[PDB]
RNA sequence: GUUACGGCGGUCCAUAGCGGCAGGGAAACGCCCGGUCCCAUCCCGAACCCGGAAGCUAAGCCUGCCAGCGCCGAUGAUACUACCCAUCCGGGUGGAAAAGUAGGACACCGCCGAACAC
RNA sequence: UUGCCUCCUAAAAUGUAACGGAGGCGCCCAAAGGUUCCCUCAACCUGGACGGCAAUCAGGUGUUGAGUGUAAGUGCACAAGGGAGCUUGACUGCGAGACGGACAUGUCGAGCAGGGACGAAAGUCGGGACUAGUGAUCCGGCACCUCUGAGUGGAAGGGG
RNA sequence: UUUCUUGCCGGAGGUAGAGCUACUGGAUGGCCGAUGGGCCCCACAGGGUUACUGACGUCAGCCAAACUCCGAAUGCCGGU
């Protein structure tokens, strides 16, 4: 908890493709980040799950 | 009646790895330390941890620049 | 100059008590402004 | 007594007690000076003591400095302790006085009673001791 | 075309009095007022963070442009402040806009001083600027005495190429400042 | 080829700095005036752009001289020390430290551009 | 007290023990990461109603002081420190070469995909100023896969 | 002969030594001169008056293992 281990999946390949922290408290809503889908071979948004 | 004292962390085997002279190749170790006590010279490169590794191949030398430490690597002559 | 963060500066004319005009820009946006005393009849600057 | 304000480390390491003093071996403040001739932790005890016969010989007038501090902890275990267990509080405070330091200087007009002072304090002193002058 | 009054009277009149009056080796030494900073610094924004809102509007009426909020660089407990906490508000005026306020603050403000008695000349820095503090804010039409909120103490300095303390007078004592000869 | 003219670059980056005294504008480096023109102020044409020569070497720039502050700084000696000799002392061979005075120094070169006379 | 990090001890490479001397930990940061650009006061005066040991402030030098996510060596007005934009080097996914340290740990050049900054100008910059911020294997999950599928036309029942 | 010994050459150190106004913690003097208490002139303007608590600063002097403006000898890493 306080900063638990989010995973980060992909919206268009929907793969969970990475892992990170993040507090929760700072940042409560769900990371959308852009990051990079091997499964789609480009950059493509992730969003915690 | 006890002492507070007692811990230690492991030594880092930090220093200079290839002293001056020593001939290197390309993106050997040549300081292990802590910051920039030898700033990266020529044909040097700093590490994420500040060590200071050969980006060619060459010997290694030690200058002074802007009253710096740095270390260099000059390229060795073909036989 | 930044074009309208800055706020609006416009030129104007004021006219003292002892009857003496002004020009100069302030941020009034009448234009016409009417002060009492100024500094051509203050007594601070007139004498004494 | 003479006990530092404060110190940074107060379990240090034991002064050691090698080579002549480097520093401090000429009188510079009074006419006389006591010089130190052996290696000793000379305590704030000891420099009291010496300081106090000095004062109480020469009575009304005169000067005395006092050029060692002794702001060196020399720590002690607490009695009937087995080795061990970490080291012991600080106990005294010692300056490491080394051969050739003049430890303390007179100025009185009366160069035998002055010395008499001197001797005073050297006995009172752990180590030997010799009465020198500023005359070269 | 269109020039400040106190700027057309310090290109044409001012200059030349200088000159005369401290003969200089060359004609770049001529004192010439440079930014006029004028500020509000809160201080009691640690209780009420909402008075740095009206200072802002406040200073942006008196001077022309928008007051830029200062923060504070340190965090001294004493008085209840932490790093970043909005703490006054500086404007500063170059060119014609300072030259124009320069001439309103000389013509207007200043004779409409409750009790006005003028200032001591004795705030120059020693360096050839001048500072000193208005008593309220309502002496500039732009802040109407009918709409004001509460006193500010307001800081006032001009900065000039003044050497010292004589050359900074000489060269407010030409532009016509008030002073509280003494 | 030369100039108190310029930029660009120069060293185990102060022997070069700081400070004090004296000097220069043909062209450069500057100083500077108003916001029709890109651009910028957590506000401000102060830093960055436009048109410039009506005017100026005050400052920066650079030149010469001052060893006052800083900087460098020997030889010698000592401290220390490797090895060796030495019953407790101490000594030999080799290496060898800051301060100061003796002292050094108010830095040290190439590319290109301007005028000068050829 | 037990693991990790920092210092001293430690005897100028590395390493070095003690129930030796001191401390930290084992987090935190989605803007404290990346990139691009820019900066600039440590304290006296004059002062700056209130607002002195402090304001918003203005000048000079203090010549690199000063201070600066969390103790040593570093980083400075060549800024690892302080502000700002980007929109997500928040540089991630495939990573010859070398290496430093028994396993474990640690360093990066460089090549490719995809992007981020800076663009004119270059083509340049692989989590945090760096070392702690962790726990092998087993066993189990959970997502994806061009794997397996206990006769199979085939699937269900394990692996990567 | 890569090992080792010796000579020479290149190299990074921060120990021994010191040095500390070069930093972080100290030391007898007087000093333009901080609260200045204290006499007060009798200003609540403003100012000498400081017998004594003595700011920064300054003067030769001194220490440190967790101090370093310095800094060996050895040792170590390479080359010959």
């Known amino acids: 908890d306080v900063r638990p281990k989010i995973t980060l999946a992909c919206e268009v390949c929907k793969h969970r493709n990475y892992i990170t922290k993040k507090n929760r408290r700072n940042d409560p809503d769900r990371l959308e980040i852009k990051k990079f889908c091997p499964n789609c071979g480009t950059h493509q948004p992730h969003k915690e799950s | 009646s006890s002492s507070r004292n007692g811990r230690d962390s492991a030594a880092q085997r930090l220093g200079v790895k290839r002293f001056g002279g020593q001939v290197v190749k390309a993106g050997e170790i040549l300081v292990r330390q802590r910051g920039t006590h030898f700033h990266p010279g020529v044909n040097v490169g700093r590490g994420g941890d500040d060590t200071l590794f050969a980006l060619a191949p060459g010997a290694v030398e030690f200058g002074a620049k802007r009253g710096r430490k740095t270390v260099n690597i000059v390229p060795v002559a073909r036989p | 100059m930044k074009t309208g963060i800055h706020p609006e500066y416009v030129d104007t004319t004021v006219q003292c008590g002892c009857g003496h005009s002004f020009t100069t820009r302030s941020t009034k946006q009448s234009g016409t402004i009417v002060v009492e005393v100024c500094s051509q009849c203050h007594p601070f600057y007139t004498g004494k | 007594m003479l006990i530092p304000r404060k110190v940074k480390h107060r379990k240090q390491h034991h002064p050691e007690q090698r080579g002549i003093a480097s520093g401090g071996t000429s009188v510079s403040f009074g006419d006389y000076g006591i010089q130190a001739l052996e290696h000793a932790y000379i305590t704030n005890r000891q420099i009291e003591s010496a300081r106090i016969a000095i004062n109480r010989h020469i009575k009304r007038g005169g000067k005395v400095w006092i050029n060692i501090f002794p702001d060196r902890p020399l720590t002690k275990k607490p009695a009937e302790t087995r080795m061990g267990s970490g080291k012991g509080s600080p106990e005294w405070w010692v300056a490491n006085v080394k051969p050739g330091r003049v430890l303390f200087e007179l100025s009185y007009p009366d160069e035998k009673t002055a010395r008499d002072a001197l001797t005073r304090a050297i006995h009172k002193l752990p180590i030997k001791a010799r009465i020198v002058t500023r005359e070269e | ?182």
């Open chain 5, 1 to 182: 075309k269109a020039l400040p009054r106190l700027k057309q009277r310090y290109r044409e009149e001012i200059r030349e009095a200088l000159q005369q009056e401290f003969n200089y080796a060359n004609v770049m030494q001529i004192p010439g007022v440079v930014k006029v900073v004028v500020n509000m610094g809160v201080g009691d924004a640690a209780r009420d963070a909402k008075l740095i809102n009206g200072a802002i509007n406040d200073l942006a009426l008196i001077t022309g442009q928008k007051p830029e909020v200062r923060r504070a660089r340190k965090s001294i407990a004493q008085f209840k402040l932490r790093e970043g906490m909005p703490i006054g508000a500086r404007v500063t005026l170059r060119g014609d806009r300072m030259w124009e306020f320069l001439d309103r603050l000389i013509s207007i403000a200043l004779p409409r001083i409750r009790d006005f008695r003028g200032l001591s000349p004795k705030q120059f820095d020693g360096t050839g600027n001048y500072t000193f503090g208005l008593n309220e804010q309502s002496m500039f039409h732009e802040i109407d005495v009918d709409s004001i909120d509460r006193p500010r103490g307001m800081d006032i300095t001009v900065v000039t190429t003044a050497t010292n303390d004589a050359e900074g007078r000489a060269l407010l004592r030409a532009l016509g400042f008030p002073f509280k000869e003494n």
